[PDB]
């Protein structure tokens, strides 16, 4: 395996480097490889040859090689280039391969972003079933920790409530999810549910009303 | 290019745990072809490859355990963990690989290539060294296939829409109550991914995994429907569901 450090960091729209450690029959044989790990997508492939940048990778990640370390460096750092990079060399024949341990890049320095919230009332479809779930969506938060509070005419509800914890999205913003799953009988007996969610101190209130779903 | 994997989603341990890939864009017998996995939180682990002469690289630790074939007539490739235990839970990756070995030869000890010889300080003919250098990287990721090694009950979803009651329209799809994961989602078939937002499973007590994905679409869409496509491997099963806001 390829040495990496395990984790590094930079601030937004600055500078960073990831290197990576072999001998003379990987990365001293002289083409290695970075690629790219976001939660939710495939592995992209970054650099080949030491220094040539694949299609679509901006001029921003360049790479070099000096002996048996290699280095992927990265300017002008944005929120998106938070992700796991790895590097990749050949070893002893075209045909075998070797990775590197893998190293997880943190963007400091991320300005606040509140949370896009959406309420979905039960469909048709399930009320016909005797079954409604209420379901409320959070997306594009960051830091990644909102609190989430239910509430039906005036009351807070607590029981069957299920909270995602915060997930990261591709665009390093957070996301989750809040599901209240409740009787047809239930959601028709009263006259409006709400998803309340707080982050960073703000809340943001979404409500639904039977006598209008 | 497309390089789509295939098989069981749900292997029970000790089992064999098969994949396929199919390709198109090119022919198998002009392109490399390999796996490479990657299990929760660990790094990406590189399984093998063969290209269009036969020629296998093995991950050297596994090698025992791994099988990796090629069926040209079928532009296939297959790979087969023997002896499946939970460690060989991944996401499992087709991939595409740019294979080259370079023959180097170089003077030795104190001559130049005067010419096309290796000559030294006065005029006699040397041997050349000969090196190799080896190129191996990754040109073409497949999207990946989730396997999971365990003796789990299989459930497939219900998928119900997801509508506003009643100037950006947002709707989506509730796929509801299914085990194990995971499920997958896309929008009229791939056509629509600006706007989609596939949000991480909750769990119920009851054992049952539950997910929604919702998407963004401008105003002027009224009348305008949007299918969502469901997909839970482990039940081979697939569900379209046409949304269209009231």
Same mark, same amino acid.
């Given at each position: 395996?390829?040495?990496?450090?395990?984790?590094?960091?930079?601030?937004?729209?600055?500078?960073?480097?990831?290197?990576?450690?072999?001998?003379?029959?990987?990365?001293?044989?002289?083409?290695?490889?970075?690629?790219?790990?976001?939660?939710?997508?495939?592995?992209?492939?970054?650099?080949?040859? /030491?220094?040539?940048?694949?299609?679509?990778?901006?001029?921003?990640?360049?790479?070099?090689?000096?002996?048996?370390?290699?280095?992927?460096?990265?300017?002008?750092?944005?929120?998106?280039?938070?992700?796991?990079?790895?590097?990749?060399?050949?070893?002893?024949?075209?045909?075998?391969?070797?990775?590197?341990?893998?190293?997880?890049?943190?963007?400091? !320095?991320?300005?606040?972003?509140?949370?896009?919230?959406?309420?979905?009332?039960?469909?048709?479809?399930?009320?016909?079933?005797? %079954?409604?779930?209420?379901?409320?969506?959070?997306?594009?938060?960051?830091?990644?920790? &909102?609190?989430?509070?239910?509430?039906?005419?005036?009351?807070?509800?607590?029981?069957?409530?299920?909270?995602?914890?915060?997930?990261?999205?591709?665009?390093?913003?957070?996301?989750?999810?809040?599901?209240?799953?409740?009787?047809?009988?239930?959601?028709?007996?009263?006259?409006?549910?709400?998803?309340?969610?707080?982050?960073?101190?703000?809340?943001?209130? %979404?409500? &639904?009303?039977?006598?209008?779903? | 290019?497309?390089?789509?994997?295939?098989?069981?989603?749900?292997?029970?341990?000790?089992?064999?745990?098969?994949?396929?890939?199919?390709?198109? !864009?090119?022919?198998?017998?002009?392109?490399?072809?390999?796996?490479?996995?990657?299990?929760?939180?660990?790094?990406?682990?590189?399984?093998?490859?063969?290209?269009?002469?036969?020629?296998? !690289?093995?991950?050297?630790?596994?090698?025992?355990?791994?099988?990796?074939? %090629?069926?040209?007539?079928?532009?296939?490739?297959?790979?087969?963990?023997?002896?499946?235990?939970?460690?060989?839970?991944?996401?499992?990756?087709?991939?595409?690989?740019?294979?080259?070995?370079?023959?180097?030869?170089?003077?030795? /000890?104190?001559?130049?290539?005067?010419?096309?010889?290796?000559?030294?300080?006065?005029?006699?003919?040397?041997?050349?060294?000969?090196?190799?250098?080896?190129?191996?990287?990754?040109?073409?990721?497949?999207?990946?296939?989730?396997?999971?090694?365990?003796?789990?009950?299989?459930?497939?979803?219900?998928?119900?829409?997801?509508?506003?009651?009643?100037?950006?329209?947002?709707?989506?799809?509730?796929?509801?109550?299914?085990?194990?994961?995971?499920?997958?989602?896309?929008?009229?078939?791939?056509?629509?991914?600006?706007?989609?937002?596939?949000?991480?499973?909750?769990?119920?007590?009851?054992?049952?995994?539950?997910?929604?994905?919702?998407?963004?679409?401008?105003?002027?869409?009224? !009348?305008?429907?949007?299918?969502?496509?469901?997909?839970?491997?482990?039940?081979?099963?697939?569900?379209?569901?046409?949304?269209?806001?009231?």
């Amino acid at each position: 395996v390829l040495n990496q450090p395990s984790s590094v960091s930079g601030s937004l729209g600055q500078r960073v480097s990831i290197t990576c450690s072999g001998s003379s029959s990987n990365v001293g044989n002289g083409y290695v490889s970075w690629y790219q790990l976001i939660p939710g997508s495939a592995p992209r492939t970054l650099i080949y040859g /030491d220094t040539s940048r694949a299609s679509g990778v901006p001029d921003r990640f360049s790479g070099s090689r000096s002996g048996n370390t290699a280095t992927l460096t990265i300017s002008s750092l944005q929120a998106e280039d938070e992700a796991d990079y790895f590097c990749a060399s050949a070893e002893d024949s075209s045909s075998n391969a070797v990775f590197g341990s893998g190293t997880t890049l943190t963007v400091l !320095g991320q300005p606040k972003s509140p949370p896009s919230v959406t309420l979905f009332p039960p469909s048709t479809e399930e009320l016909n079933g005797n %079954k409604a779930t209420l379901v409320c969506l959070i997306s594009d938060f960051y830091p990644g920790s &909102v609190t989430v509070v239910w509430k039906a005419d005036g009351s807070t509800i607590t029981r069957n409530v299920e909270t995602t914890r915060a997930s990261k999205q591709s665009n390093s913003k957070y996301a989750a999810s809040s599901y209240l799953s409740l009787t047809s009988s239930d959601w028709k007996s009263k006259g409006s549910y709400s998803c309340e969610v707080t982050h960073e101190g703000s809340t943001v209130t %979404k409500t &639904v009303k039977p006598s209008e779903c | 290019v497309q390089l789509r994997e295939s098989g069981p989603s749900l292997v029970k341990p000790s089992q064999t745990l098969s994949l396929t890939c199919t390709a198109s !864009g090119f022919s198998l017998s002009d392109k490399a072809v390999g796996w490479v996995r990657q299990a929760p939180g660990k790094a990406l682990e590189w399984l093998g490859n063969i290209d269009t002469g036969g020629i296998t !690289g093995y991950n050297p630790g596994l090698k025992s355990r791994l099988s990796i074939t %090629k069926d040209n007539s079928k532009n296939q490739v297959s790979l087969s963990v023997s002896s499946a235990t939970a460690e060989d839970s991944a996401t499992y990756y087709c991939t595409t690989v740019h294979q080259k070995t370079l023959e180097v030869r170089s003077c030795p /000890d104190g001559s130049r290539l005067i010419g096309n010889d290796c000559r030294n300080e006065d005029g006699d003919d040397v041997n050349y060294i000969t090196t190799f250098d080896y190129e191996w990287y990754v040109d073409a990721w497949g999207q990946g296939l989730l396997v999971t090694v365990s003796s789990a009950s299989t459930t497939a979803p219900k998928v119900y829409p997801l509508s506003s009651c009643c100037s950006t329209v947002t709707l989506g799809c509730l796929v509801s109550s299914y085990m194990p994961e995971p499920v997958t989602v896309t929008w009229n078939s791939g056509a629509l991914k600006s706007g989609v937002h596939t949000f991480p499973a909750v769990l119920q007590s009851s054992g049952l995994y539950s997910l929604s994905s919702m998407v963004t679409v401008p105003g002027s869409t009224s !009348g305008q429907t949007f299918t969502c496509n469901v997909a839970h491997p482990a039940s081979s099963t697939k569900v379209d569901k046409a949304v269209e806001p009231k």
